[PDB]
Design a protein around this ligand. Structure first.
Ligand SMILES: Nc1ncnc2c1ncn2[C@@H]1O[C@H](COP(=O)(O)OP(=O)(O)OP(=O)(O)O)[C@@H](O)[C@H]1O
Ligand SMILES: Nc1ncnc2c1ncn2[C@@H]1O[C@H](COP(=O)(O)OP(=O)(O)OP(=O)(O)O)[C@@H](O)[C@H]1O
Ligand SMILES: Nc1ncnc2c1ncn2[C@@H]1O[C@H](COP(=O)(O)OP(=O)(O)O)[C@@H](O)[C@H]1O
Ligand SMILES: Nc1ncnc2c1ncn2[C@@H]1O[C@H](COP(=O)(O)OP(=O)(O)O)[C@@H](O)[C@H]1O
Ligand SMILES: [Mg+2]
Ligand SMILES: [Mg+2]
Lengths: 529, 402, 316
C-alpha cells in the first residue's frame, strides 16, 4: 500500500510498486528470518527512458525512504578522465567508505547508494559496431570486479540511469550483476493533473492563487509535455504575475500601494503557454510556417480529390486496430506544387506529434551521418500514442544524378527497412513522402513498400487557367477577355509554381504592354505534354 | 426543391445583391426569404439565404465572390440545391461574434468606428438570414467595405412568456453582435457592443530608455528583465511564501557589435548590485584552478551572509570555444548544477555561433533563456544617433544644416 | 513439488534457478509487509511465512527470462492477425511444414534439414514461418531479422550472423529462422550491387553440420527466386515450397466471410460482380483495401471497394 502521492512522485504508480517488491522487500524484514530463509540482497537496478520524466526524484526518494546515507554522484563521460591509470583510480575512490564501514561494524552497516549517470558511455563497445567510430573498453572490467567477485560487499547498491537502452553491453545484465530493469515514460492524462496538483500546493495553502483557475483545462490543453516543463510553466506564470506589480522607473524597488493581493490569474497561465515554454516531444510551429507560403487555392477537381483522400487516410490510422502503420506516396511533374499539399494534410490532422525531416537541414553531410540523423528522427516518433512524419525529395537524400547512375546504397537500404517496421505496441504512425521522379523509384523496387499512391496533375485546360487567374485576382475583365481569346486551344501545360513567377515577371512592365509580354512568355515556355 | 435539384453556379448580378450576402435566384425557381442547402460533395454542404432577381436565368444560382471563395464554388459548375427549414426554437441566434477588418488595404484608415452603429446596421441588413461559423462575407458600413468572418454563434433564449453553441443559425431582429478586429489590424473600434479581445498582452513597467543609454532594444530588455530578474527585487519573504526559485542561466547570441555587453552591464548598474567580473573564453584553453578562482568571493560572501548576499554577475565571454576542454565544462556544470551550488550566482554567456553550442547545456534547470540581438532598423539607427549626438547638442556646438 | 518445477524449466542455465528461487521467496515475503510509516516491519504475520506454489508460478511467468530458451513475446510482433483458412494452399503448406518438423526429430541419418519459402510479394511468407516454428515446441527458437541491424557494416553483420548460429549448437534441438534474405545481401537491380562476404558466409553456414548428437532446422523466406537461382544459392536448400495468391471469385467470397466485415446484402452484389471474372491480389493487400473502404458512409462502402479493386486488384 505504498503511498506515493505524499512523496512528490505522481503518475509513476505501478513502476514504483514493482521496483519495490522485486528488489527491496528483503532489506526491511528483520535479519533473523532473512537468514533462516537464506536470501541474499539485490545489488543493481537499471532505469531507461526519455529525459525529464522524474527518475532522479525516484532515486532520491527511494534512497531516503529506508533511512540510509545520502547518495553519492558520478558522471559517465567524466570518469573517462585525462587518461588511463587515473581512470581506475577515480573508480577506486568511491567504495573505500563502504568497505571501511563493513569492517568496523561488520554486517550491520547502512546502505550506501551510488547513482551513476549516462552509464552507456563508460561501458560501450556496441557503438563501434555502427558505421565508423571505435574505442577500447577497460573501465567496465574494474567496475564489474568491484560490483561482484572478491572482497564483495553486502551493504551496497548501484542504480544505473540511461537515455538509450540498446547500447548497453550484455555483460552487465546477468544475474548477480544489474538484475531489475525498468522503463519510465512520458506522463499520461492523469499524470499531468497529479503533477500540477503536487507542484502547486504551497501557494494554494497560503491563499495566493485565484479562484478563476481550473487545473483540468490546463491539464487537457498540454499534450505530450514532459515532467520538468510543467514546473517551468508554473514558474513563468508566477514570474509574470510578480512582474506586473514592480512599479519602478529609477533604481528599481517594490511598490506597497499595489502589493497586497498578489494573485496569479488564468491569463498569466495562458500568456505563458504561448510564448515561454516550448515542448520537445510535440508540435513544431516553426516548420509548417515557412512551407505553405501563399496558401491553397481551389482551381479544379484534383485539389478536392487529393484533400479528400488525405482526410480518409488520416482518419483510418486513428480508428483502426489491424493496420497500425500506413504510408502514402505523392508524385507528379516538377513545379506542380506538392511539397505544400503534404504540409497542409499533416497540419489538418491535429496529431500531437508532427515533425518534418526535409533534406534542407543537411548540407554537406556524409552517407553515415545521414543514416544517423534519420534513425534519430524516426526513433523520437516511437514515444507518442500518435505520430505523423513527412519526407521531402526522396531523390535528393539518395543523390541520384543521371550520369552514372550513382547513389548511396546505404541510405536506400536503411530507408527501405524503416518503412515496414511497426511501432512497439498500441501506437499509430503515419508516413508521407514526396517525389518528382516516379520512373527511377520503380526500378529500385521501392513502390512495393508504399501501401498506396496519389497523383497531383498540372493545369491542362484553358478554363482552369482562367479560373486560377480570376481567383488570384490580378488581371481585370478587359485583359481577361483579351487573354481569354488567344488561349483557345487545349495545349496549356504549366505548373502552378511557374505561373506565379510568370505573373510577377509580367507585372513589372508598363501598363499597356503587360498582356503581350505575358502571352509571349506563355508561348516561349512551350507545352511538351 | 424539397428533395433537391441540380443547378448551375453563376455570378452575382448586382453590387447591392453582392453586399446582401444572399444567393441570387430566379423567381421561376424559388421565392425570396427561403433558405437552401447547397451540396458540392458528400462532405461539403453550405446553407444560404435566397433573394430573387429578374436577370437570373432559370437553372442557375448566382453567388458573390466572397460566397464562392467560402464555399469553394466555381462559375459554371454543377451543384445540388435543396430547401432547408430552420428549427427556430433552437437555431435562432442570440449572440454572435464576428471578426472584422478592412476589405481593401488601399482604403485603410485610423478613424474610429462605432460598433453599436455597425451592430445595428448589421441587424438591419442581415435580419432573417442564415450564418454559419467560419463564414466569410463583405459588409458595407458608412460607404466602407469590411471583411467579416463568423467566429462563434450562440442560440437565443426563450421569450419571457416561456447558452448553446451552434454551427449554423438564423439572424433575427433581437440578435446581438460582438465585433473584434483581426490580428494586427489597424481598425479602431469604439463602443460597448465589442468583443474587445486584447486580453493576451503583458503589462510592463515604464522604463526610460533614452536616459538608460539604450535605443532600439526595448522588447529584448523587457523580456529579459521579466524572465530573469523580476524575482531578486521582491523581498525574500514573499519568495519563500510562494515557493519559487531563481533562474541561473541566460544566453545571448548575435552578430558582432550590437549591444550585448551593454544590455547586461546596464542592468548590473540598476539593481545596485556588485560590479561585474568579466572573464575571457579563448585565453583559458592549471585551468581548473583558474576556473575555481572566479567564484571564491561569491562563496565567501554566501558563507558570511547565507541567504542575504547581493547578486554576483559573471559575463563569461564566447562559449563556443570552451564548450563544444571537457574538464572545464564538467566543472562549470557542477558549480551551477548539482547538489552543491551557490544561490547568489548568475551566469551570462555570449557567442556568435548558435548552432555549434552543445545541447546538454540547454535544458530546463540549466541555461533556460535564449535571445537574439540582430542589426538595428531605421528606428534604432535614429535613436542611436540621437543618443550619441546629445553632448554636442547641449554646448551649442552643432550646425542647423545637419 | 520439485519434480514439476524441474520438468517445466528447459534450457535453464545454472544461475537462473537461484534467480527463480530468490524471486519466489521475495514475492511470498512481500505479502507480510504492512508498514507505511517509515517501513520497519509487520507483526501479526511475521509467523506463518511460507512460499506456496502460486508465487513460484507467478515468478516463472513474469520475472525470469532465460537466455537459451523460447521467447514468446517476440512472436506478438509477427503473427499479428492470426491465420485464416481461405484455400487449399494453407492446408498444404501447414502439412508439409509439420512433416518437415517431424523429420528433424525422429531421424538418425539427417541431423540437418533446411527449407525455403518463396512467392509473390504481399502473399504472407513470414506469418506462416512464424506459425510453423511456434508449433514445434522446440526449446530454442530464435528469429534473425534485418530490422535489428539498421545501419550496420559488413563485418558487424557477419559477426551477428555467426554469433546467432553459434548459440544453436549448444542446445539439444533448435529452430533458427531467417526472413527477407534479399534485404540482408543489400540487393538493388541497378548495377547489380550486393555484398559478396555475406553471401559466402551464408552459404558456408548453410552447409555446416552441428556437433554430434544434436539437431537443427533452418527456415528462410524470399521474394525473388530467380535472382537467388543465379547466385547458385538454390542448391544449398534441401526443399522449397510455393505460396500462391487469391485467384478466383469464390476464394475471395470465402475470405470476405471469414474476416466478417461486409454483410449479406452487400455480399450479394459483390458476388454478382466478382464471380464473372478472375482476380489477382495478395492476402495482405486485401485487409488494407477493406479497411480503406470501411471509413466511408454506410451507403457507399460497396462502390469504393469495387472501384479500388479495379485499379490494383484484377491487375496482373
Ligand atoms: N493546389 C494548389 N493551388 C494553389 N496554390 C497552390 C497549390 N499547391 C501549392 N500552392 C502554392 O503554390 C506554391 C507551390 O509550390 P511549391 O512550393 O510546393 O513547389 P514544389 O512543388 O515544392 O517544388 P518542387 O517539388 O519542384 O521542389 C506555394 O506557394 C503554395 O502556396
Ligand atoms: N493465412 C494467412 N496467410 C498469410 N497472412 C495472413 C493469413 N491470415 C492472416 N494473415 C495476415 O496477413 C499478413 C500477411 O503477411 P505479412 O504482413 O507478414 O506480409 P508478407 O507478404 O509476408 O511480407 P513481405 O512483403 O515482407 O514478404 C500476416 O502478417 C497476417 O497479419
Ligand atoms: N513525476 C514527477 N512529479 C513531480 N516532479 C517531477 C516529476 N518528474 C519530473 N519532475 C521534476 O523534474 C525535476 C528533476 O528532473 P530529473 O528527473 O532529474 O530529470 P532527468 O531524470 O532527465 O535527469 C524536478 O525538479 C521535478 O520537479
Ligand atoms: N543600441 C545601442 N544604443 C546605444 N549605443 C550602442 C548600441 N549598440 C552599441 N552601442 C555602442 O557600441 C559599443 C558596442 O561595444 P560592445 O557592447 O563591447 O559590443 P559587443 O558587446 O557586441 O562586443 C558600446 O560602446 C555602445 O555604447
Ligand atoms: Mg519540394
Ligand atoms: Mg516479408
Amino acid at each position: 500500500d505504498w503511498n506515493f502521492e505524499k512523496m512528490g512522485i505522481g503518475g509513476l504508480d505501478k513502476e514504483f510498486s514493482d521496483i519495490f517488491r522485486r528488489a527491496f522487500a528483503s532489506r526491511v524484514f528483520p535479519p533473523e528470518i532473512v537468514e533462516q530463509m537464506g536470501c541474499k540482497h539485490v545489488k543493481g537496478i537499471l532505469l531507461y527512458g526519455p529525459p525529464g520524466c522524474g527518475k532522479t526524484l525516484l532515486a532520491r526518494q527511494i534512497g531516503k525512504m529506508l533511512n540510509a546515507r545520502e547518495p553519492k554522484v558520478v558522471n559517465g563521460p567524466e570518469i573517462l578522465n585525462k587518461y588511463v591509470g587515473e581512470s581506475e583510480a577515480n573508480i577506486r575512490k568511491l567504495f573505500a567508505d563502504a568497505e571501511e564501514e563493513q569492517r568496523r561494524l561488520g554486517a550491520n552497516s547502512g546502505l550506501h547508494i551510488i547513482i551513476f549517470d549516462e552509464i552507456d558511455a563508460i561501458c560501450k563497445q556496441r557503438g563501434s559496431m555502427a558505421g565508423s567510430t571505435g574505442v577500447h573498453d577497460t573501465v567496465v572490467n574494474q567496475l564489474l570486479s568491484k560490483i561482484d567477485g572478491v572482497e564483495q560487499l553486502n551493504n551496497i547498491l548501484v542504480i544505473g540511469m540511461t537515455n538509450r537502452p540498446d547500447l548497453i553491453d550484455e555483460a552487465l545484465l546477468r544475474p548477480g550483476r544489474l538484475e531489475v530493469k525498468m522503463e519510465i515514460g512520458l506522463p499520461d492524462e492523469k499524470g499531468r493533473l497529479q503533477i500540477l496538483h503536487i507542484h502547486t500546493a504551497r501557494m494554494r495553502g497560503h491563499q495566493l492563487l485565484s479562484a478563476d483557475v481550473d487545473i483540468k483545462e490546463l491539464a487537457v490543453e498540454t499534450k505530450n509535455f514532459s515532467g520538468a516543463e510543467l514546473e517551468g510553466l508554473v514558474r513563468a506564470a508566477q514570474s509574470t504575475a510578480m512582474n506586473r506589480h514592480i512599479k519602478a522607473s529609477t533604481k528599481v524597488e517594490v511598490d506597497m500601494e499595489k502589493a497586497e493581493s498578489l494573485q496569479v490569474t488564468r491569463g498569466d497561465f495562458l500568456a505563458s503557454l504561448e510564448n515561454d515554454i516550448k515542448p520537445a516531444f510535440g508540435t513544431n510551429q516553426e516548420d509548417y510556417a515557412s512551407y505553405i507560403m501563399n496558401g491553397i487555392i481551389k482551381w479544379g477537381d484534383p485539389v478536392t480529390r487529393v484533400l479528400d483522400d488525405g482526410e480518409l487516410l488520416v482518419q483510418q490510422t486513428k480508428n483502426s486496430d489491424r493496420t497500425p502503420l500506413v504510408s502514402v506516396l505523392l508524385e507528379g511533374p516538377p513545379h506542380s506544387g506538392k511539397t505544400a499539399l503534404a504540409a497542409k494534410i499533416a497540419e489538418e490532422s491535429n496529431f500531437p506529434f508532427i515533425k518534418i525531416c526535409s533534406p534542407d537541414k543537411m548540407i554537406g553531410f556524409s552517407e553515415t551521418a545521414k543514416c544517423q540523423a534519420m534513425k534519430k528522427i524516426f526513433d523520437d516518433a516511437y514515444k507518442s500514442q500518435l505520430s505523423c512524419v513527412v519526407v521531402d525529395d526522396i531523390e535528393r537524400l539518395l543523390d541520384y544524378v543521371p550520369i552514372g547512375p550513382r547513389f548511396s546504397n546505404l541510405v536506400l537500404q536503411a530507408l527501405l527497412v524503416l518503412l515496414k517496421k511497426a511501432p512497439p505496441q498500441g501506437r499509430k504512425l503515419l508516413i508521407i513522402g514526396t517525389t518528382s521522379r516516379k520512373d527511377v523509384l520503380q526500378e529500385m523496387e521501392m513502390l512495393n513498400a508504399f501501401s498506396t499512391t496519389i497523383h497531383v496533375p498540372n493545369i491542362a485546360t484553358g478554363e482552369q487557367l482562367l479560373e486560377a487567374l480570376e481567383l488570384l485576382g490580378n488581371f481585370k475583365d478587359k485583359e481577361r477577355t483579351t487573354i481569354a481569346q488567344q488561349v483557345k486551344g487545349k495545349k496549356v501545360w504549366i505548373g502552378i509554381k511557374k505561373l506565379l513567377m510568370l505573373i510577377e515577371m509580367s507585372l513589372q512592365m508598363d501598363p499597356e504592354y503587360r498582356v503581350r509580354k505575358f502571352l509571349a512568355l506563355l508561348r516561349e515556355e512551350g507545352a511538351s505534354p | 426543391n424539397m428533395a433537391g435539384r441540380s443547378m448551375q453556379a453563376a455570378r452575382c448580378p448586382t453590387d447591392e445583391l453582392s453586399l446582401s450576402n444572399c444567393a441570387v435566384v430566379s423567381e421561376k425557381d424559388y421565392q425570396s426569404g427561403q433558405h437552401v442547402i447547397v451540396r458540392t460533395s458528400p462532405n461539403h454542404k453550405y446553407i444560404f439565404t435566397l433573394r430573387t432577381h429578374p436577370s437570373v436565368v432559370p437553372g442557375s444560382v448566382a453567388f458573390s465572390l466572397p460566397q464562392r471563395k467560402w464555399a469553394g464554388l466555381s462559375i459554371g459548375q454543377e451543384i445540388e440545391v435543396a430547401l432547408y427549414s430552420f428549427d427556430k426554437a433552437k437555431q435562432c441566434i442570440g449572440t454572435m461574434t464576428i471578426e472584422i477588418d478592412f476589405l481593401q488595404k488601399k482604403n485603410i484608415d485610423s478613424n474610429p468606428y462605432d460598433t453599436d452603429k455597425m451592430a445595428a446596421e448589421f441587424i438591419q441588413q442581415f435580419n432573417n438570414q442564415a450564418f454559419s461559423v467560419g463564414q466569410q462575407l463583405v459588409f458595407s458600413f458608412n460607404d466602407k467595405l469590411f471583411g467579416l468572418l463568423v467566429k462563434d454563434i450562440e442560440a437565443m433564449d426563450p421569450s419571457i412568456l416561456k447558452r448553446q453553441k451552434i454551427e449554423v443559425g438564423l439572424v433575427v431582429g433581437n440578435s446581438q453582435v460582438a465585433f473584434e478586429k483581426a490580428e494586427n489590424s489597424s481598425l479602431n473600434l469604439i463602443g460597448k457592443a465589442k468583443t474587445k479581445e486584447n486580453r493576451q498582452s503583458i503589462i510592463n513597467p515604464d522604463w526610460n530608455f533614452e536616459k538608460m543609454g539604450i535605443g532600439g532594444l526595448d522588447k529584448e530588455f523587457s523580456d529579459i528583465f521579466r524572465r530573469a530578474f523580476a524575482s531578486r527585487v521582491f523581498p525574500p519573504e514573499i519568495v519563500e511564501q510562494m515557493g519559487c526559485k531563481h533562474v541561473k542561466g541566460i544566453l545571448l547570441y548575435g552578430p558582432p557589435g550590437c549591444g550585448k555587453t551593454l544590455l547586461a552591464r546596464q542592468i548590473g548598474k540598476m539593481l545596485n548590485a556588485r560590479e561585474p567580473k568579466v572573464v575571457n573564453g579563448p585565453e583559458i584553453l592549471e585551468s581548473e584552478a583558474n576556473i575555481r578562482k572566479l567564484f571564491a568571493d561569491a562563496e565567501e560572501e554566501q558563507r558570511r551572509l547565507g541567504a542575504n548576499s547581493g547578486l554576483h554577475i559573471i559575463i563569461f565571454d564566447e562559449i563556443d570555444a570552451i564548450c563544444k576542454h571537457d574538464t572545464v565544462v564538467n566543472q562549470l556544470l557542477s558549480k551551477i548544477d548539482g547538489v552543491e551550488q551557490l544561490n547568489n550566482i548568475l551566469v551570462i554567456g555570449m557567442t556568435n555561433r548558435p548552432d555549434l553550442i552543445d545541447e546538454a547545456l540547454l535544458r530546463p534547470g540549466r541555461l533556460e533563456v535564449k535571445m537574439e540581438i540582430g542589426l538595428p532598423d531605421e528606428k534604432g539607427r535614429l535613436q542611436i544617433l540621437h543618443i550619441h549626438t546629445a553632448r554636442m547638442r547641449g554646448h551649442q556646438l552643432l550646425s542647423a544644416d545637419v
